Design a protein around this motif. Structure first.
Motif, PDB file in Angstrom:
ATOM      1  N   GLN A   1       0.756  -1.174  -0.063  1.00  0.00           N
ATOM      2  CA  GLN A   1      -0.084  -0.021   0.118  1.00  0.00           C
ATOM      3  C   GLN A   1       0.703   1.147  -0.100  1.00  0.00           C
ATOM      4  O   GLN A   1       1.810   1.461   0.626  1.00  0.00           O
ATOM      5  CB  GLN A   1      -0.874  -0.036   1.146  1.00  0.00           C
ATOM      6  CG  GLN A   1      -1.988   1.218   1.422  1.00  0.00           C
ATOM      7  CD  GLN A   1      -2.595   1.095   2.568  1.00  0.00           C
ATOM      8  OE1 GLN A   1      -2.763   0.052   3.054  1.00  0.00           O
ATOM      9  NE2 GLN A   1      -2.943   2.197   2.946  1.00  0.00           N
ATOM     10  N   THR A   2       0.338   2.432  -0.693  1.00  0.00           N
ATOM     11  CA  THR A   2       1.139   3.701  -0.737  1.00  0.00           C
ATOM     12  C   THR A   2      -0.056   4.430   0.098  1.00  0.00           C
ATOM     13  O   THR A   2      -0.794   4.595  -0.053  1.00  0.00           O
ATOM     14  CB  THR A   2       1.048   4.112  -2.135  1.00  0.00           C
ATOM     15  OG1 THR A   2       1.683   3.313  -3.086  1.00  0.00           O
ATOM     16  CG2 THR A   2       1.725   5.472  -2.087  1.00  0.00           C
TER      17      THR A   2
ATOM     18  N   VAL B   1       8.770   7.274  -2.461  1.00  0.00           N
ATOM     19  CA  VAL B   1       8.253   7.167  -3.686  1.00  0.00           C
ATOM     20  C   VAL B   1       8.475   8.362  -4.346  1.00  0.00           C
ATOM     21  O   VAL B   1       8.926   8.631  -5.561  1.00  0.00           O
ATOM     22  CB  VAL B   1       6.948   6.616  -3.898  1.00  0.00           C
ATOM     23  CG1 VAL B   1       6.356   6.625  -5.189  1.00  0.00           C
ATOM     24  CG2 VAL B   1       6.985   5.008  -3.364  1.00  0.00           C
TER      25      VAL B   1
ATOM     26  N   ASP C   1       5.070  10.475  -0.093  1.00  0.00           N
ATOM     27  CA  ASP C   1       4.375   9.095  -0.521  1.00  0.00           C
ATOM     28  C   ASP C   1       5.418   8.162  -0.356  1.00  0.00           C
ATOM     29  O   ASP C   1       6.722   8.177  -1.001  1.00  0.00           O
ATOM     30  CB  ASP C   1       4.000   9.172  -1.922  1.00  0.00           C
ATOM     31  CG  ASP C   1       2.762  10.033  -2.120  1.00  0.00           C
ATOM     32  OD1 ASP C   1       2.136  10.571  -1.020  1.00  0.00           O
ATOM     33  OD2 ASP C   1       2.347  10.388  -3.389  1.00  0.00           O
TER      34      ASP C   1
ATOM     35  N   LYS D   1       5.779   3.815  -0.066  1.00  0.00           N
ATOM     36  CA  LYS D   1       5.212   2.339  -0.488  1.00  0.00           C
ATOM     37  C   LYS D   1       5.755   1.236   0.782  1.00  0.00           C
ATOM     38  O   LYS D   1       6.916   0.940   0.621  1.00  0.00           O
ATOM     39  CB  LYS D   1       5.715   1.965  -1.796  1.00  0.00           C
ATOM     40  CG  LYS D   1       4.954   0.685  -2.402  1.00  0.00           C
ATOM     41  CD  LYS D   1       5.309   0.190  -3.687  1.00  0.00           C
ATOM     42  CE  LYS D   1       4.524  -0.825  -4.131  1.00  0.00           C
ATOM     43  NZ  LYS D   1       3.016  -0.208  -4.555  1.00  0.00           N
TER      44      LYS D   1
ATOM     45  N   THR E   1       6.809  -1.905   2.130  1.00  0.00           N
ATOM     46  CA  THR E   1       7.425  -2.977   1.621  1.00  0.00           C
ATOM     47  C   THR E   1       7.238  -4.382   2.512  1.00  0.00           C
ATOM     48  O   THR E   1       6.862  -5.429   1.905  1.00  0.00           O
ATOM     49  CB  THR E   1       9.104  -2.894   1.176  1.00  0.00           C
ATOM     50  OG1 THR E   1       9.476  -2.420   2.377  1.00  0.00           O
ATOM     51  CG2 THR E   1       9.274  -1.713   0.061  1.00  0.00           C
TER      52      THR E   1
END
Ligand SMILES: [Mg+2]
Ligand SMILES: [Mg+2]
Ligand SMILES: [Mg+2]
Ligand SMILES: [Mg+2]
Lengths: 103, 72
Positions: A18-19, A64, A95, A97, A99
């Protein structure tokens, strides 16, 4: 599997892949950031926090992008008082992400 | 040194007050004159020495002396 962590004075429930948009962080784009203060991890069973933060909870994320949000317009006006003022604002964000979530 | 390169010294040229050109300027509407009264009127204001109707200072005090003509 989701986990709760606190970043910019705010909390986020996330899952792998999810970002999430956070307040600006002082890291470069491709760098990896680790959040060590995990409030809760829930996979099949749920791990709470006897004291704040689960013992070995680590959330790994990759930065990101860095950007500014949508423009908001501030309007101040005082009727019959000959007073008016306007101002713009764009809030910075970062932003990331998600992992990996480590129990 | 070219005609599109010369600049005035800092502080030499001040802008100048422009009254009645909006709220943002700070001199809009009344233009620094306040509200009503004789002093807000076009061409309004009292003459030099006027203190209301009170006998003015330059008429309350006595005249004195004479001009010499030899001093000139
Ligand atoms: Mg004012
Ligand atoms: Mg008026
Ligand atoms: Mg009045
Ligand atoms: Mg007045």
């Amino acid at each position: 599997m989701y986990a709760v962590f606190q970043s910019g004075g705010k909390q986020h429930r996330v899952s792998e892949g999810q970002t999430v948009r956070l307040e600006k962080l002082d890291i470069a784009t491709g760098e990896t950031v680790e959040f060590a203060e995990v409030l809760m991890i829930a996979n099949g069973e749920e791990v709470k926090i006897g004291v704040p933060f689960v013992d070995g909870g680590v959330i790994k994320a990759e930065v990101v992008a860095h950007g500014r949000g949508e423009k908001v317009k501030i309007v101040k006006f005082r009727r019959r008082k000959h007073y008016r003022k306007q101002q713009g604002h764009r809030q910075w964000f970062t932003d990331v992400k998600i992992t990996g979530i480590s129990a | 040194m070219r005609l599109n390169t010369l600049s005035p010294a800092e502080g030499s040229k001040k802008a100048g007050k422009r009254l009645g050109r909006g709220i943002g300027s700070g001199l809009g509407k009344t233009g620094g004159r306040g509200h009503k009264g004789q002093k807000s009127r076009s061409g309004g204001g009292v003459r030099r020495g006027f203190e209301g109707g009170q006998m003015p200072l330059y008429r309350r005090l006595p005249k004195f002396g004479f001009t010499s003509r030899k001093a000139a």
